[PDB]
């Protein structure tokens, strides 16, 4: 009966708001204030939101969704029938919740210490080492140290996490957790679709990789860089080698065309974390999109507390499920990398605000990729030399242009293989083809195969390098970032065309375009109410994911890399 189904969705929606709001409160409090106490209230509210999920979920499963005519209702009920962890028996649920908490806590409080010297946390200290040291041995100390302290300490938890997450997936009708994660795209051809996108980025990626390898060879010496082999994973300016723009100084295409020290510019001009968020807010409002509410400025944690409070530093954006309270929790350092991060997070806030009037079951991105893409799209415009000039962080030439595209490539292109491999690994862990006997080995096998990277120190038994990357102990799916990086360029392209830009796509800055804002807004308003091809069609006027926009953006760089690599005789790739 349609009327009983409609009443159920109404009752689900009012009751979810309340319970989700409380849960979000306690999680927030833990995340911003890791103590025995907040941890206990968190584990408590876990049981509460599960009891709600189990009640409504058991109700939802009694409806034959086949017989439902209204498609919105049908879709809400189908999703409520998935209980996630709340399908587990009470004992296993308690253990699962404890395992997650323990993994996240371990990661978030790990330090790496010099004997008789000072301890370094990941943010800011170890991050700053990976970004600015140009000494092999110091990079190595930070890279190995982090894996020794974060990664190896996660290993004790991960087999049990895999068992429980998979058990929950099976109890919701999936074959394993990885199947459940992939189902969020509602795209049976996902794996194939992503593989093809990955393959189209290989020319750019291999040419980038070879040119960076050459430059590393020049700086670190021939005894440390094989010009036909993988790059050591500690030399790319980032703990995970997932983005390479911190080694821009080593790889500048045109060192004659100098570029401002944007960090020193930000610092010298008294930028603060608050200023960084306010500029993102200005950009969203310039498009005719929504401002963040006053409450956001009062409640968000935009820098690392100095008061001895221990926190989850890893930046994140929060929906409190009442349509009024949205926040960001970021340990913001004043630099360009973090400004892009602030935009990314403000993009999530903007989405929470555009879909806040949907039923809570439909308050998500069209697919998780879309959620990740919004803030990045704006940041692409922010990053342009012309925009950075207007912010007084930079001072025509082909030389400055190739330099710019290189800077962008070191972020965008370098991330393509990393973002692809993380869930290639986890999918295989979840489906049981990687056991705990070879977690680490299979990880490095994909690091090699996709990114062309090798470990600077041979791994041993007891290593679990995956555990040294946040998303792994925190159980946050990763393929969304791969989708994001592809579709963000398609969105930029479409927004630029809508805004009347002509000329090379990389020169576009959509600041203040209402036409561009209006496309984003009508897509974000759909939330999860329709298949994601419809939101794609709304923004871009076609319904597929496609690498052609990102290739078009980087085409002048591709031509330059090819000429450069050919001139030097590079052999692209590695064995
Ligand atoms: C299938 O059912 C959906 C959902 O219906 C809504 O949710 C149910 C659980 C019940 O509570 C329904 O009584 C309830 O309306 C229908 O979608 C809804 O359609 C209405 C009217 O077309 C939309 O209303 C708009 O509301 C805005 C304010 O937000 C007004 O300013 C607009 O002028 C406009 O009238 C409403 O957004 C929409 N709801 C959702 C969540 O999508 C749908 O129409 C129906 N399909 C069929 C076959 O009729
Ligand atoms: C709970 C998820 C937090 C996550 N935190 C950010 C900082 C994050 O982990 N990442 C990913 C990462 O840092 O591994 C890459 C992604 C794209 C560029 C901006 C930062 C984004 C996010 O907001 O998606
Ligand atoms: C401002 C406002 O009233 N928003 C509500 C929203 O909370 C609710 O989820 C939806 C119907 O479920 O209708 C609308
Ligand atoms: C941190 O948590 C403790 C223990 O729950 C609490 O008593 C204290 O007031 C909190 N500090 C902040 C900054 O909220
Ligand atoms: Cl690693
Ligand atoms: Cl995802
Ligand atoms: Zn994100």
XYZ file of C-alpha atoms and ligand atoms in Angstrom:
679
model
C 0.000 0.000 0.000
C 1.326 3.386 -1.122
C -0.152 5.151 1.890
C 1.580 2.945 4.456
C 4.861 3.374 2.553
C 4.528 7.172 2.450
C 3.772 7.308 6.234
C 6.798 5.113 6.956
C 9.115 7.485 5.044
C 7.615 10.428 6.873
C 8.202 8.700 10.226
C 11.736 7.621 9.230
C 12.589 11.173 8.232
C 11.399 12.960 11.441
C 12.996 10.350 13.763
C 16.305 10.155 11.793
C 16.844 13.934 12.094
C 16.779 13.757 15.862
C 18.946 10.687 16.373
C 21.497 11.589 13.626
C 21.755 15.085 15.152
C 22.699 13.596 18.516
C 25.132 11.162 17.035
C 26.875 13.918 15.036
C 27.167 15.940 18.336
C 28.971 13.166 20.165
C 31.246 12.289 17.223
C 32.152 15.966 16.846
C 32.941 16.156 20.555
C 35.214 13.169 20.412
C 36.910 14.336 17.174
C 37.578 17.769 18.666
C 38.505 16.427 22.132
C 39.766 12.899 22.347
C 39.284 11.769 25.989
C 38.140 8.641 27.812
C 34.869 10.514 28.526
C 33.896 11.740 24.986
C 34.973 8.317 23.697
C 32.505 6.629 26.082
C 29.585 8.909 25.141
C 30.464 8.285 21.502
C 30.363 4.469 21.872
C 27.078 4.987 23.701
C 25.429 7.058 20.963
C 26.666 4.448 18.507
C 24.327 1.958 20.209
C 21.528 4.471 20.103
C 21.690 5.283 16.373
C 21.978 1.502 15.688
C 18.797 0.763 17.655
C 16.993 3.372 15.451
C 18.537 1.981 12.272
C 17.594 -1.591 13.250
C 14.015 -0.615 14.032
C 13.349 1.319 10.819
C 15.445 -1.072 8.730
C 13.459 -4.098 9.919
C 10.278 -2.118 9.087
C 11.587 -1.159 5.606
C 12.407 -4.750 4.706
C 8.756 -5.785 5.133
C 7.814 -3.591 2.207
C 7.934 -5.209 -1.212
C 9.625 -2.371 -3.057
C 8.672 -4.139 -6.301
C 5.005 -3.191 -5.626
C 5.718 0.493 -4.896
C 4.625 2.918 -7.607
C 6.091 6.228 -6.300
C 9.764 6.094 -7.289
C 11.072 8.558 -4.585
C 9.440 6.521 -1.837
C 10.658 3.283 -3.437
C 14.199 4.566 -3.454
C 14.037 5.817 0.142
C 12.708 2.466 1.382
C 15.276 0.433 -0.603
C 18.087 2.447 0.995
C 16.614 2.257 4.521
C 16.569 -1.579 4.079
C 20.355 -1.458 4.275
C 21.259 -1.427 7.919
C 25.079 -1.262 7.524
C 26.794 -2.188 10.808
C 23.451 -2.190 12.646
C 22.765 -5.542 10.980
C 25.464 -7.155 13.164
C 24.566 -9.054 16.439
C 24.971 -6.770 19.465
C 28.277 -8.373 20.495
C 29.893 -7.929 17.060
C 28.484 -4.445 16.693
C 30.043 -3.389 19.973
C 33.380 -4.901 18.936
C 33.137 -3.285 15.466
C 32.450 0.157 16.932
C 35.334 -0.274 19.329
C 37.682 -1.358 16.530
C 36.864 1.697 14.428
C 37.310 4.021 17.351
C 40.597 2.417 18.288
C 41.991 2.543 14.726
C 41.043 6.228 14.296
C 42.454 7.084 17.722
C 45.741 5.235 17.082
C 46.226 7.032 13.786
C 45.305 10.435 15.172
C 47.621 10.349 18.207
C 50.701 8.614 16.663
C 53.994 10.505 16.922
C 57.507 9.930 15.589
C 60.338 10.767 18.002
C 64.083 11.407 17.761
C 65.722 9.443 20.692
C 66.395 12.027 23.490
C 64.793 14.643 21.100
C 61.282 15.944 20.362
C 58.243 13.999 19.098
C 56.635 15.011 15.793
C 52.934 14.626 14.938
C 51.701 14.192 11.345
C 50.180 17.661 11.227
C 52.043 20.011 10.978
C 55.463 18.668 11.720
C 55.937 15.530 9.593
C 53.905 17.091 6.753
C 56.282 20.072 6.761
C 59.340 17.743 6.702
C 57.986 15.797 3.643
C 57.142 19.156 1.974
C 60.416 21.117 2.496
C 63.345 18.808 3.297
C 65.606 18.134 0.289
C 67.827 15.678 2.129
C 67.361 11.984 1.375
C 68.075 10.801 4.883
C 65.717 13.261 6.608
C 62.847 12.408 4.210
C 63.586 8.793 4.911
C 63.448 9.235 8.676
C 59.962 10.862 8.453
C 58.624 8.439 5.819
C 59.742 5.232 7.631
C 59.015 6.694 11.075
C 55.414 7.433 10.240
C 54.884 3.922 8.851
C 56.608 2.374 11.878
C 54.390 4.222 14.361
C 51.010 4.635 12.548
C 50.918 1.836 10.049
C 52.398 -0.967 12.138
C 50.096 -0.113 15.092
C 46.944 -0.428 12.893
C 47.827 -3.954 11.807
C 46.594 -5.586 15.064
C 43.062 -4.253 14.303
C 42.675 -4.627 10.555
C 41.887 -8.390 10.101
C 39.025 -8.124 12.586
C 37.753 -4.943 10.968
C 37.687 -6.683 7.606
C 35.817 -9.666 9.018
C 33.163 -7.480 10.720
C 32.653 -4.986 7.926
C 32.253 -7.846 5.507
C 29.874 -9.683 7.860
C 27.709 -6.580 8.015
C 27.813 -6.277 4.209
C 26.666 -9.890 3.817
C 23.847 -9.313 6.308
C 22.664 -6.482 4.078
C 22.610 -8.669 0.903
C 26.101 -7.747 -0.568
C 28.894 -10.291 -1.114
C 31.463 -8.207 0.765
C 32.117 -4.601 1.973
C 33.752 -3.640 -1.313
C 30.621 -4.659 -3.247
C 28.559 -2.540 -0.816
C 30.887 0.472 -1.334
C 30.841 0.221 -5.170
C 26.971 -0.011 -5.042
C 26.889 3.650 -3.985
C 27.466 4.607 -7.630
C 24.507 2.462 -8.881
C 26.614 1.780 -11.976
C 27.120 -1.963 -12.803
C 29.868 -1.079 -15.263
C 31.817 0.937 -12.610
C 35.019 -1.089 -12.570
C 35.305 -1.100 -16.326
C 34.353 2.575 -16.608
C 37.051 3.590 -14.126
C 39.703 1.373 -15.795
C 39.077 3.061 -19.135
C 39.392 6.545 -17.518
C 42.610 5.445 -15.853
C 43.981 4.202 -19.207
C 43.273 7.522 -20.903
C 45.379 9.415 -18.301
C 48.392 7.151 -18.788
C 50.126 9.323 -21.490
C 50.023 12.338 -19.215
C 50.934 10.341 -16.110
C 53.879 8.424 -17.651
C 55.329 11.600 -19.213
C 54.987 13.502 -15.948
C 56.544 10.618 -14.068
C 59.556 10.389 -16.398
C 60.225 14.149 -16.327
C 59.967 14.276 -12.513
C 62.252 11.172 -12.253
C 64.863 12.997 -14.390
C 64.674 16.075 -12.126
C 65.008 13.913 -9.061
C 68.063 12.311 -10.645
C 69.635 15.763 -11.104
C 69.031 16.644 -7.401
C 69.493 13.360 -5.478
C 72.094 11.802 -7.787
C 72.439 8.905 -10.162
C 73.168 6.402 -7.397
C 69.692 7.040 -5.908
C 67.398 7.329 -9.003
C 67.133 4.680 -11.686
C 66.143 6.510 -14.896
C 64.359 3.392 -16.069
C 62.757 2.326 -12.828
C 60.264 3.408 -10.139
C 60.723 6.588 -8.102
C 61.473 6.237 -4.369
C 58.283 7.052 -2.497
C 59.715 9.550 -0.051
C 60.937 12.186 -2.585
C 57.693 13.718 -3.962
C 56.995 16.196 -1.181
C 54.041 14.352 0.375
C 53.833 11.551 2.970
C 51.936 9.314 0.471
C 53.406 10.680 -2.756
C 49.755 11.271 -3.710
C 50.433 14.887 -4.776
C 53.805 16.212 -5.914
C 53.400 19.999 -5.990
C 55.724 20.507 -2.987
C 58.691 19.534 -5.234
C 57.747 22.166 -7.799
C 61.072 23.999 -6.985
C 62.991 20.911 -8.251
C 61.029 20.496 -11.497
C 60.297 24.037 -12.694
C 60.068 23.912 -16.569
C 61.212 27.566 -16.896
C 63.321 28.624 -13.850
C 63.972 31.924 -15.650
C 60.313 32.817 -15.001
C 60.353 33.015 -11.142
C 57.157 32.442 -9.121
C 56.271 34.143 -5.797
C 56.658 32.346 -2.507
C 52.875 32.184 -2.022
C 53.282 30.886 1.564
C 55.602 33.715 2.454
C 53.112 36.047 0.715
C 50.207 34.670 2.742
C 52.214 34.911 5.992
C 53.659 38.337 5.183
C 50.181 39.611 4.423
C 48.747 38.279 7.662
C 46.447 35.612 6.241
C 44.838 33.499 8.976
C 42.752 30.268 8.811
C 39.676 32.444 9.187
C 40.706 34.526 6.186
C 41.204 31.363 4.129
C 37.590 30.223 4.853
C 36.187 33.692 4.307
C 37.750 33.823 0.809
C 36.156 30.419 -0.039
C 32.841 31.767 1.257
C 33.263 34.818 -1.009
C 33.877 32.620 -4.034
C 30.748 30.540 -3.398
C 28.630 33.689 -2.923
C 30.184 35.284 -6.009
C 28.540 32.472 -8.005
C 25.138 33.215 -6.382
C 25.559 30.088 -4.173
C 24.804 30.058 -0.435
C 26.829 31.704 2.316
C 27.721 29.590 5.298
C 25.402 30.439 8.290
C 26.632 32.580 11.237
C 26.597 29.428 13.373
C 29.327 27.964 11.185
C 31.741 30.768 12.138
C 30.920 30.243 15.821
C 31.064 26.439 15.916
C 33.720 25.259 13.398
C 37.239 24.316 14.516
C 39.402 26.059 11.868
C 42.736 25.644 13.659
C 44.519 23.161 15.855
C 43.595 23.906 19.548
C 46.573 25.124 21.522
C 45.007 24.224 24.917
C 46.539 20.717 25.340
C 43.296 19.255 23.792
C 44.179 16.338 21.527
C 42.123 16.181 18.221
C 41.526 14.475 14.893
C 43.437 16.979 12.748
C 42.465 15.435 9.365
C 40.179 18.023 7.717
C 36.466 17.228 7.428
C 33.069 18.798 6.908
C 30.054 18.089 9.047
C 26.308 17.971 8.570
C 24.377 17.956 11.879
C 21.150 16.987 10.044
C 18.928 19.866 11.199
C 19.351 22.075 8.147
C 21.047 24.869 10.198
C 24.265 23.552 11.804
C 27.169 22.849 9.405
C 30.816 22.909 10.442
C 34.411 22.338 9.373
C 37.087 20.741 11.549
C 40.532 21.457 10.102
C 43.993 22.026 11.607
C 44.590 24.779 9.029
C 48.144 25.909 8.294
C 48.555 29.133 6.347
C 49.654 28.035 2.859
C 48.268 27.450 -0.619
C 47.817 23.689 -0.163
C 45.565 24.318 2.787
C 43.664 27.063 0.997
C 42.719 24.497 -1.701
C 41.768 22.103 1.146
C 39.588 24.806 2.705
C 37.782 25.189 -0.646
C 37.335 21.384 -0.869
C 35.691 21.335 2.575
C 33.562 24.432 1.866
C 32.330 22.525 -1.221
C 30.968 19.787 1.053
C 29.327 22.497 3.232
C 27.738 23.995 0.129
C 26.284 20.636 -0.871
C 24.869 20.032 2.697
C 23.165 23.430 2.392
C 21.731 22.908 -1.132
C 20.129 19.520 -0.277
C 19.095 20.308 3.337
C 15.353 20.190 2.483
C 15.434 16.673 1.036
C 14.506 13.670 3.141
C 17.618 12.705 5.094
C 17.902 9.398 3.169
C 18.485 11.439 -0.032
C 20.875 13.975 1.521
C 24.067 12.796 -0.248
C 25.862 13.623 -3.483
C 24.518 12.284 -6.742
C 27.412 9.882 -6.223
C 30.236 10.216 -3.651
C 32.426 11.635 -6.451
C 30.147 14.653 -6.906
C 30.390 15.462 -3.194
C 34.178 15.540 -3.456
C 34.197 17.558 -6.701
C 32.367 20.796 -5.890
C 34.984 22.649 -3.829
C 37.734 21.470 -6.141
C 36.005 22.977 -9.130
C 36.122 26.432 -7.473
C 39.720 25.849 -6.352
C 40.727 25.288 -9.973
C 39.712 28.925 -10.628
C 41.340 30.138 -7.369
C 44.648 28.516 -8.405
C 44.861 30.446 -11.661
C 47.729 33.029 -11.853
C 45.148 35.724 -12.534
C 43.081 34.864 -9.435
C 46.174 34.511 -7.197
C 47.367 37.870 -8.558
C 44.046 39.412 -7.490
C 44.563 38.036 -4.005
C 48.040 39.672 -4.015
C 49.830 36.289 -3.809
C 51.466 36.485 -7.294
C 53.076 39.433 -9.225
C 51.494 36.819 -20.251
C 54.315 34.432 -21.177
C 54.223 30.935 -22.534
C 56.915 30.242 -19.941
C 54.677 31.219 -16.966
C 51.917 29.235 -18.601
C 53.839 25.917 -18.864
C 55.093 26.555 -15.346
C 51.489 26.943 -14.145
C 50.268 23.799 -15.915
C 53.227 21.881 -14.361
C 52.222 23.106 -10.904
C 48.637 21.909 -11.505
C 49.799 18.612 -12.990
C 51.914 17.817 -9.941
C 48.648 17.904 -7.939
C 46.007 16.674 -10.377
C 47.763 14.185 -12.650
C 50.001 12.650 -9.953
C 46.932 11.919 -7.827
C 45.181 9.930 -10.629
C 47.071 6.666 -10.055
C 47.174 7.011 -6.268
C 43.437 7.637 -6.049
C 42.807 4.653 -8.276
C 44.954 2.187 -6.369
C 43.685 2.675 -2.787
C 40.363 0.876 -3.330
C 41.831 -1.488 -5.898
C 43.738 -2.758 -2.859
C 40.824 -2.587 -0.425
C 38.364 -4.205 -2.835
C 40.719 -7.199 -3.027
C 41.149 -7.259 0.758
C 37.376 -7.297 1.206
C 36.771 -9.966 -1.472
C 39.386 -12.135 0.263
C 42.017 -12.320 -2.542
C 44.519 -10.396 -0.335
C 44.848 -12.003 3.110
C 46.671 -10.567 6.077
C 49.756 -12.571 5.057
C 50.197 -10.256 2.077
C 48.423 -6.984 2.798
C 51.681 -5.093 2.540
C 53.123 -6.882 -0.464
C 49.980 -6.386 -2.502
C 49.980 -2.719 -1.527
C 53.531 -2.227 -2.851
C 52.708 -4.263 -5.931
C 50.020 -1.711 -6.830
C 52.133 1.279 -5.778
C 54.579 -0.050 -8.356
C 52.061 -1.006 -11.065
C 49.926 2.182 -11.005
C 52.145 4.980 -9.559
C 55.614 3.693 -10.555
C 56.874 4.097 -7.004
C 59.088 1.892 -4.870
C 59.675 1.885 -1.077
C 63.039 3.562 -0.080
C 63.431 0.973 2.652
C 62.577 -2.713 2.011
C 59.412 -3.625 3.859
C 59.499 -6.324 6.599
C 56.966 -8.564 8.366
C 54.683 -6.532 10.600
C 54.617 -3.520 8.245
C 51.204 -2.287 7.197
C 51.831 0.836 5.157
C 48.121 1.190 4.284
C 47.420 1.853 7.937
C 49.572 5.010 7.671
C 47.014 6.638 5.399
C 44.023 8.178 7.142
C 41.195 6.718 5.006
C 42.284 3.175 5.824
C 41.934 3.141 9.662
C 39.006 5.620 9.406
C 37.154 3.322 6.905
C 36.467 6.117 4.403
C 36.135 4.880 0.788
C 38.729 6.294 -1.637
C 37.501 5.791 -5.244
C 35.285 8.902 -4.835
C 38.532 10.977 -5.095
C 39.489 9.334 -8.402
C 35.978 10.007 -9.787
C 36.228 13.562 -8.372
C 39.462 14.406 -10.160
C 38.032 13.275 -13.525
C 34.586 14.942 -13.283
C 35.878 18.125 -11.654
C 37.554 18.987 -14.990
C 34.336 18.174 -16.888
C 32.542 20.559 -14.502
C 35.155 23.270 -14.969
C 34.886 22.942 -18.759
C 31.080 23.166 -18.661
C 31.068 26.084 -16.183
C 33.635 27.954 -18.206
C 31.584 27.558 -21.403
C 28.482 28.654 -19.511
C 30.391 31.703 -18.219
C 31.405 32.759 -21.816
C 35.175 31.983 -21.419
C 36.980 31.300 -24.705
C 40.582 30.351 -25.208
C 42.526 27.591 -23.448
C 40.535 25.955 -20.666
C 43.357 26.341 -18.140
C 43.027 30.174 -18.371
C 39.397 30.140 -17.138
C 38.374 31.714 -13.860
C 34.703 31.449 -13.137
C 34.736 33.950 -10.281
C 31.407 35.828 -10.068
C 29.652 33.815 -12.794
C 25.986 33.415 -11.969
C 25.446 31.146 -14.971
C 28.090 28.826 -13.515
C 26.592 28.951 -9.990
C 23.127 28.132 -11.329
C 24.294 24.932 -13.006
C 25.992 23.748 -9.842
C 22.982 24.668 -7.651
C 20.354 22.769 -9.667
C 22.585 19.685 -9.630
C 23.381 19.876 -5.911
C 19.675 20.323 -5.121
C 18.932 16.834 -6.523
C 20.969 15.329 -3.730
C 20.688 11.559 -4.088
C 17.117 11.761 -5.412
C 17.972 10.620 -8.989
C 20.624 8.467 -10.842
C 23.854 10.510 -11.021
C 23.825 10.716 -14.907
C 21.031 13.293 -14.497
C 23.149 15.558 -12.307
C 26.036 15.041 -14.804
C 23.640 16.072 -17.655
C 22.496 19.152 -15.752
C 26.014 20.451 -15.319
C 27.721 19.357 -18.527
C 24.894 18.713 -21.012
C 25.824 15.035 -21.387
C 25.604 12.060 -18.945
C 28.940 10.232 -18.887
C 32.117 10.527 -16.976
C 34.945 11.435 -19.430
C 38.638 12.162 -19.249
C 38.405 14.411 -22.340
C 38.060 17.631 -20.259
C 41.107 16.906 -18.080
C 43.104 15.968 -21.202
C 42.013 19.158 -22.907
C 43.046 21.223 -19.856
C 46.593 19.665 -19.811
C 47.094 19.282 -23.607
C 49.694 22.157 -23.844
C 51.589 20.481 -21.024
C 51.321 17.094 -22.680
C 52.917 18.536 -25.854
C 55.740 20.153 -23.813
C 56.429 16.969 -21.792
C 56.657 14.848 -24.911
C 59.136 17.228 -26.616
C 61.156 17.477 -23.328
C 61.216 13.747 -22.638
C 62.083 12.948 -26.278
C 64.968 15.439 -26.209
C 66.405 13.688 -23.146
C 65.702 10.207 -24.434
C 63.490 9.194 -21.549
C 62.184 5.654 -21.486
C 58.642 6.091 -20.149
C 57.459 3.541 -17.578
C 59.337 1.089 -15.379
C 59.440 -2.723 -15.066
C 6.325 10.772 -5.375
O 6.446 11.236 -4.038
C 7.346 12.355 -3.943
C 7.616 12.639 -2.477
O 6.449 13.097 -1.777
C 6.697 13.812 -0.601
O 7.173 12.851 0.340
C 6.233 11.794 0.689
C 6.904 10.931 1.738
C 4.937 12.419 1.200
O 5.263 13.186 2.400
C 4.385 13.296 0.092
O 3.088 13.775 0.401
C 5.387 14.430 -0.111
O 4.971 15.481 -0.972
C 6.717 13.521 -4.683
O 7.640 14.610 -4.656
C 7.321 15.841 -4.105
O 6.519 16.585 -5.013
C 6.205 17.897 -4.485
C 5.163 18.503 -5.390
O 5.474 18.191 -6.729
C 7.467 18.757 -4.349
O 7.140 20.061 -3.786
C 7.785 21.272 -4.097
O 7.964 21.881 -2.818
C 8.663 23.132 -2.901
C 9.129 23.463 -1.508
O 10.158 22.551 -1.173
C 7.693 24.124 -3.525
O 8.143 25.444 -3.380
C 7.560 23.761 -4.984
O 6.682 24.693 -5.641
C 7.109 22.260 -5.084
O 5.693 22.200 -4.965
C 8.444 18.000 -3.454
O 9.729 18.598 -3.464
C 8.652 16.545 -3.869
N 9.402 15.897 -2.812
C 10.560 15.248 -2.942
C 11.274 14.935 -1.660
O 10.997 14.916 -4.039
C 6.439 13.138 -6.137
O 5.714 14.211 -6.700
C 5.663 11.823 -6.256
N 5.538 11.325 -7.631
C 4.376 11.077 -8.255
C 4.268 9.849 -9.126
O 3.431 11.845 -8.100
C 36.161 12.164 6.173
C 36.774 12.553 4.826
C 37.671 13.762 4.995
C 38.407 14.161 3.708
N 39.537 15.006 4.065
C 40.287 15.535 2.933
C 41.309 16.508 3.507
C 40.970 14.394 2.173
O 41.250 13.350 2.791
N 41.215 14.507 0.837
C 42.029 13.468 0.152
C 43.378 13.147 0.870
O 43.948 14.076 1.445
O 43.844 11.961 0.839
C 42.236 14.047 -1.255
C 40.997 14.921 -1.474
C 41.008 15.867 -2.692
C 41.855 17.093 -2.474
C 41.535 17.736 -1.135
C 41.704 16.830 0.097
C 40.820 15.600 -0.099
C 37.444 14.842 2.735
O 37.068 16.005 3.064
O 37.044 14.192 1.744
C 13.013 23.965 5.980
C 12.206 22.686 6.019
O 11.086 22.675 6.514
N 12.743 21.538 5.528
C 12.055 20.247 5.449
C 12.966 19.007 5.623
O 13.578 18.926 6.914
C 12.237 17.681 5.382
O 13.184 16.594 5.378
C 11.416 17.716 4.085
C 10.415 16.576 4.069
O 10.974 15.362 4.585
O 10.630 18.926 3.873
C 11.249 20.177 4.138
C 37.003 18.032 26.637
O 36.375 16.850 27.154
C 36.382 16.756 28.596
C 36.007 15.332 28.946
O 34.764 15.031 28.338
C 35.428 17.852 29.072
O 35.131 17.754 30.469
C 36.071 19.191 28.693
O 35.208 20.249 29.071
C 36.318 19.286 27.173
N 37.058 20.424 26.646
C 36.557 21.160 25.648
C 37.476 22.126 24.954
O 35.377 21.059 25.335
Cl 52.936 3.749 1.636
Cl 33.322 6.150 -2.856
Zn 36.015 15.630 0.680
